[PDB]
Amino acid sequence: HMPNFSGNWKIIRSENFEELLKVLGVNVMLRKIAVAAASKYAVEIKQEGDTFYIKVSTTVYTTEINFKVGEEFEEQTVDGRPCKSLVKWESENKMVCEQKLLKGEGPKTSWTKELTNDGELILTMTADDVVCTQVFVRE
Protein backbone atom coordinates (compact mmCIF):
# COMPACT_ATOMS: atom_id res chain seq x y z
CA HIS A 1 0.00 0.00 0.00
CA MET A 2 2.13 2.86 -1.45
CA PRO A 3 1.34 6.61 -0.88
CA ASN A 4 -1.79 7.77 -2.81
CA PHE A 5 -4.98 9.76 -1.94
CA SER A 6 -5.48 7.42 1.06
CA GLY A 7 -5.26 8.90 4.55
CA ASN A 8 -6.71 11.44 6.95
CA TRP A 9 -6.79 15.11 5.93
CA LYS A 10 -7.55 18.32 7.83
CA ILE A 11 -8.37 21.67 6.16
CA ILE A 12 -5.90 24.62 6.37
CA ARG A 13 -7.44 27.10 3.88
CA SER A 14 -10.92 27.69 2.46
CA GLU A 15 -11.31 30.34 -0.26
CA ASN A 16 -14.66 31.41 -1.83
CA PHE A 17 -16.86 29.02 0.19
CA GLU A 18 -19.35 31.75 1.07
CA GLU A 19 -19.83 32.89 -2.55
CA LEU A 20 -20.32 29.26 -3.69
CA LEU A 21 -23.22 28.95 -1.20
CA LYS A 22 -24.68 32.27 -2.30
CA VAL A 23 -24.85 30.99 -5.90
CA LEU A 24 -26.63 27.92 -4.53
CA GLY A 25 -29.16 30.30 -2.93
CA VAL A 26 -28.26 29.83 0.76
CA ASN A 27 -29.25 32.77 2.99
CA VAL A 28 -26.74 35.08 4.69
CA MET A 29 -27.03 33.77 8.24
CA LEU A 30 -26.60 30.12 7.13
CA ARG A 31 -23.69 30.96 4.85
CA LYS A 32 -21.94 32.48 7.87
CA ILE A 33 -22.64 29.46 10.07
CA ALA A 34 -21.45 27.22 7.21
CA VAL A 35 -18.24 29.21 6.90
CA ALA A 36 -17.55 28.76 10.64
CA ALA A 37 -18.39 25.03 10.44
CA ALA A 38 -16.01 24.68 7.44
CA SER A 39 -12.82 25.38 9.36
CA LYS A 40 -13.31 21.95 10.98
CA TYR A 41 -13.57 19.98 7.70
CA ALA A 42 -11.80 16.64 7.95
CA VAL A 43 -11.55 14.13 5.11
CA GLU A 44 -10.77 10.46 5.31
CA ILE A 45 -9.95 8.60 2.06
CA LYS A 46 -9.30 4.92 1.36
CA GLN A 47 -8.28 4.40 -2.27
CA GLU A 48 -7.68 1.01 -3.88
CA GLY A 49 -6.83 1.12 -7.56
CA ASP A 50 -9.82 2.72 -9.26
CA THR A 51 -12.08 2.55 -6.25
CA PHE A 52 -12.69 5.09 -3.52
CA TYR A 53 -14.16 5.45 -0.11
CA ILE A 54 -14.47 9.09 1.06
CA LYS A 55 -15.73 10.44 4.42
CA VAL A 56 -16.20 14.22 4.75
CA SER A 57 -17.08 15.52 8.18
CA THR A 58 -17.44 18.66 10.26
CA THR A 59 -18.25 18.87 14.00
CA VAL A 60 -21.91 17.86 13.73
CA TYR A 61 -22.24 16.17 10.30
CA THR A 62 -20.53 13.41 8.30
CA THR A 63 -21.08 11.89 4.84
CA GLU A 64 -19.59 8.91 3.00
CA ILE A 65 -19.37 8.17 -0.67
CA ASN A 66 -18.04 5.08 -2.45
CA PHE A 67 -17.35 5.22 -6.16
CA LYS A 68 -15.39 3.68 -8.95
CA VAL A 69 -13.78 6.01 -11.41
CA GLY A 70 -15.78 5.76 -14.65
CA GLU A 71 -19.00 4.46 -13.04
CA GLU A 72 -22.10 6.53 -12.19
CA PHE A 73 -23.07 6.89 -8.51
CA GLU A 74 -25.55 8.93 -6.47
CA GLU A 75 -24.62 11.63 -4.00
CA GLN A 76 -25.48 15.22 -3.14
CA THR A 77 -24.59 18.76 -4.21
CA VAL A 78 -22.95 20.99 -1.58
CA ASP A 79 -26.54 22.16 -0.81
CA GLY A 80 -28.14 18.72 -0.28
CA ARG A 81 -29.98 18.19 -3.59
CA PRO A 82 -29.54 14.55 -4.84
CA CYS A 83 -27.56 14.11 -8.03
CA LYS A 84 -25.98 11.58 -10.39
CA SER A 85 -22.19 11.96 -10.30
CA LEU A 86 -19.40 10.66 -12.55
CA VAL A 87 -15.66 10.83 -11.80
CA LYS A 88 -12.86 10.83 -14.39
CA TRP A 89 -9.09 11.08 -14.04
CA GLU A 90 -7.47 14.23 -15.48
CA SER A 91 -3.85 13.34 -14.66
CA GLU A 92 -1.93 11.08 -12.30
CA ASN A 93 -3.22 12.71 -9.21
CA LYS A 94 -6.36 14.62 -10.13
CA MET A 95 -9.96 13.55 -10.60
CA VAL A 96 -12.95 15.60 -11.73
CA CYS A 97 -16.62 14.89 -11.11
CA GLU A 98 -19.59 16.13 -13.17
CA GLN A 99 -22.95 16.23 -11.36
CA LYS A 100 -26.50 16.17 -12.82
CA LEU A 101 -29.53 16.83 -10.59
CA LEU A 102 -31.95 13.88 -10.10
CA LYS A 103 -34.86 16.33 -9.84
CA GLY A 104 -35.22 19.97 -10.83
CA GLU A 105 -33.12 22.63 -12.52
CA GLY A 106 -30.32 24.52 -10.77
CA PRO A 107 -26.68 25.67 -11.35
CA LYS A 108 -24.09 23.37 -13.01
CA THR A 109 -22.09 21.76 -10.18
CA SER A 110 -18.75 19.95 -10.16
CA TRP A 111 -15.85 19.09 -7.89
CA THR A 112 -12.19 18.05 -8.21
CA LYS A 113 -9.61 16.53 -5.86
CA GLU A 114 -5.87 16.59 -6.46
CA LEU A 115 -2.73 15.52 -4.62
CA THR A 116 0.09 18.06 -5.13
CA ASN A 117 3.84 17.32 -5.32
CA ASP A 118 4.40 18.58 -1.78
CA GLY A 119 1.75 16.36 -0.16
CA GLU A 120 -1.39 18.53 -0.05
CA LEU A 121 -4.88 17.56 -1.11
CA ILE A 122 -6.74 20.27 -3.03
CA LEU A 123 -10.56 20.22 -3.40
CA THR A 124 -12.33 22.55 -5.80
CA MET A 125 -16.14 22.89 -5.95
CA THR A 126 -17.80 24.76 -8.80
CA ALA A 127 -21.25 26.24 -9.15
CA ASP A 128 -21.66 28.02 -12.51
CA ASP A 129 -18.96 30.67 -12.67
CA VAL A 130 -17.92 30.37 -8.97
CA VAL A 131 -14.95 28.18 -7.87
CA CYS A 132 -14.32 27.26 -4.18
CA THR A 133 -10.85 26.01 -3.15
CA GLN A 134 -10.02 24.08 -0.01
CA VAL A 135 -6.47 22.93 0.86
CA PHE A 136 -5.91 20.00 3.25
CA VAL A 137 -2.83 18.40 4.79
CA ARG A 138 -2.17 14.98 6.30
CA GLU A 139 -3.54 14.82 9.83
Ligand X SMILES: *C/C(=C/c1ccccc1)C(=O)OC
Cβ atoms < 10 Å from Cβ of 119:
10
133 bridge partner residues: 15, 124
* The only residue of 59, 63, 66, 116 in contact with ligand X, by rule CB under 6 A: 63
Q: Is 102 helix (H, G, I), strand (E, B) or coil?
A: coil
Alpha carbons 19 and 4: distance in angstroms, whole number? 31
Interacting stretch for ligand X, rule CB under 6 A, among 1-9, 17-25, 29-37, 71-79? 71-79
Segment near ligand X (CB under 6 A); pick from 13-21, 22-30, 72-80, 114-122: 72-80
| Cβ pair 90, 32 in contact under 8 A | no
User: What is the distance between the alpha carbons of residues 14 and 36, in angstroms, rounded to a whole number?
Assistant: 11
**Cα separation of 48 and 1, whole Å?**
9
Print the binding letters for residues 18-57 with ligand X: x by CB under 6 A, - otherwise: ------------------------------------x-x-
Q: Does 120 bind ligand X (CB under 6 A)?
A: no
Nearer to ligand X, 37 or 65 (CB): 65
Q: Judged by CB, which is closer to ligand X: 21, or 113?
A: 113
**Residue 104 three-state SS:** coil
Smallest gap from Cβ 67 to ligand X, in A, equals 9
Applying CB under 6 A, the residues found at the interface with ligand X are 54, 56, 63, 65, 75, 77-78, 111, 113, 123, 125
